[PDB]
Amino acid sequence: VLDLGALGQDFAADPYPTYARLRAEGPAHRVRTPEGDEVWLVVGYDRARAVLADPRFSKDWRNSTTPLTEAEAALNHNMLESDPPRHTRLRKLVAREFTMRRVELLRPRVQEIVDGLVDAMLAAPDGRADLMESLAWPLPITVISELLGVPEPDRAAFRVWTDAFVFPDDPAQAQTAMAEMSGYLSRLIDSKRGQDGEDLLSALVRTSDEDGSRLTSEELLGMAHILLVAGHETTVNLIANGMYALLSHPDQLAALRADMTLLDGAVEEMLRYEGPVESATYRFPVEPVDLDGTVIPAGDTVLVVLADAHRTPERFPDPHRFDIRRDTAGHLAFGHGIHFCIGAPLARLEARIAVRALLERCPDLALDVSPGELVWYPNPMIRGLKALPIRWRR
């Protein structure tokens, strides 16, 4: 068993080599996460892709031998942690709210939000700021919060809770954060009841109250939680990671600035090259599964290392090169199969508007920190930065 925690920040900063060595030996490996969790890592583009859509790997905890704490159990009734027929019903309930068609209608508002955030950031007295604090975090939380009716003054709280989840300074920290959030969400849900809010949460509350068969009280909390959390944490990191890749690759940045029609393709490469989801969410084999000779017992935790699939030479030639014009068709940054990120259209909209706004309004935009000064999350599931200092005055 490889102890990833023993590799320290060197692993967090650059985990790809480790993932590659493992892929060379086999598709599945038992590892010890920095958090102390003993789990399985599935590496290799082909294998990764197959497992993601393989019904033998359930996402329903009833098939997991790992116990759910009280706090975790309260939020566990969501589409992501479910298999059909439950998953099918939960997702269909809100699928229409997130199609590209619907999401496109949000462009004017997303533009407003970005414009305002950029206006505030560029007013910095010394032409310096942290992109994470000034844009990466604020944008996604604002968008999903307006959709789900989370009052603006309560938004800063999710960042605190997210930090407690991502890089918990203590196991209990994560749990306390989950209980707080769960309580906040239940109260918010309550405050919506009876009122005629036009936001999605209010709509969901109504649906739940009118027909508990379509959405039980527990599935209601589960939905509020997954949509709000998955609704911004990864987007925040895509924006920061992507802008970091771009600004740290002079020729790619110059290429994009020279032909902004390459913007959409650049965002795709950011997803492929430095996607926010290093490893997919927990999967549990219903029955023992044999992967090219290795047998993962039923009930064990399995993480499909998307980060490694994206560095597989066979699918992405010269994988370590950040190439905005590269062919990225079929990458797994948004997953694969029935769980394919329901927020992909929205994420792409947010990321594209943010990156375009920074380039078009900040011609002298540059990094204001050195690689060694950057702090990456050790969690094998999250690829992200603690902060991203930038400047725009040469």
Binding site for ligand HEM (CB under 6 A): 52, 79-80, 91, 98, 144, 226-227, 230-231, 234-235, 238, 275-277, 280-281, 333-335, 339, 341-343, 346-347
Minimum gap (Å) between residue 394 Cβ and ligand HEM = 30
Minimum gap (Å) between residue 140 Cβ and ligand HEM = 6
State yes or no: 79 annotated in a binding site: no
| Backbone region of residue 36 per phi and psi (left: phi > 0; alpha: psi in -120 to 50; beta: other values) | left
Residue 80 or residue 367: which is nearer to ligand HEM going by CB? 80
Residue 108 or residue 372: which is nearer to ligand HEM going by CB? 108
State yes or no: 132 annotated in a binding site: no
**Helices in the chain by DSSP H: which ranges?**
8-13, 16-25, 45-53, 70-75, 86-94, 100-104, 107-121, 131, 138-147, 156-166, 171-192, 200-210, 217-229, 233-247, 250-258, 263-274, 306-309, 344-361
State in Å, rounded, how far the first CA of the chain is from the last one.
Answer: 49
* Tokens encoding 243: 């802008």
Minimum gap (Å) between residue 369 Cβ and ligand HEM = 22
Residue 268 or residue 368: which is nearer to ligand HEM going by CB? 268
State yes or no: 48 annotated in a binding site: no
Classify 193 as helix, strand or coil.
coil
Classify 61 as helix, strand or coil.
helix
Residue 71 or residue 228: which is nearer to ligand HEM going by CB? 228
The DSSP-derived string for 280-349 is: ---BEESS-EEETTEEEPTT--EEE-HHHHTT-TTTSSSTTS--TTS--TT--TT-SSTTS-TTHHHHHH
State yes or no: 225 annotated in a binding site: yes
State yes or no: 121 annotated in a binding site: no
State yes or no: 341 annotated in a binding site: yes
Minimum gap (Å) between residue 306 Cβ and ligand HEM = 6
Residue 143 or residue 365: which is nearer to ligand HEM going by CB? 143
Minimum gap (Å) between residue 391 Cβ and ligand HEM = 25
Q: What is the spatial distance between Cα 239 and Cα 347, in angstroms, rounded to a whole number?
A: 9
Give yes or no for a contact between 236 and 136, defined as CB atoms under 8 angstroms apart. yes
Minimum gap (Å) between residue 277 Cβ and ligand HEM = 4
Minimum gap (Å) between residue 363 Cβ and ligand HEM = 26
Residue 59 or residue 326: which is nearer to ligand HEM going by CB? 59
State yes or no: 176 annotated in a binding site: yes
Q: What is the spatial distance between Cα 290 and Cα 161, in angstroms, rounded to a whole number?
A: 38
State yes or no: 81 annotated in a binding site: yes
Which of 45, 3, 69, 50 has the alpha carbon at shortest distance from 285?
50
Residue 149 or residue 231: which is nearer to ligand HEM going by CB? 231
State yes or no: 120 annotated in a binding site: no
The residue whose Cβ lies closest to ligand HEM is 343
Which residues does the annotation place in the binding site for heme? 341
Which residues does the annotation place in the binding site for substrate? 81, 174-178, 225-233
Which residues does the annotation place in the binding site? 81, 174-178, 225-233, 341
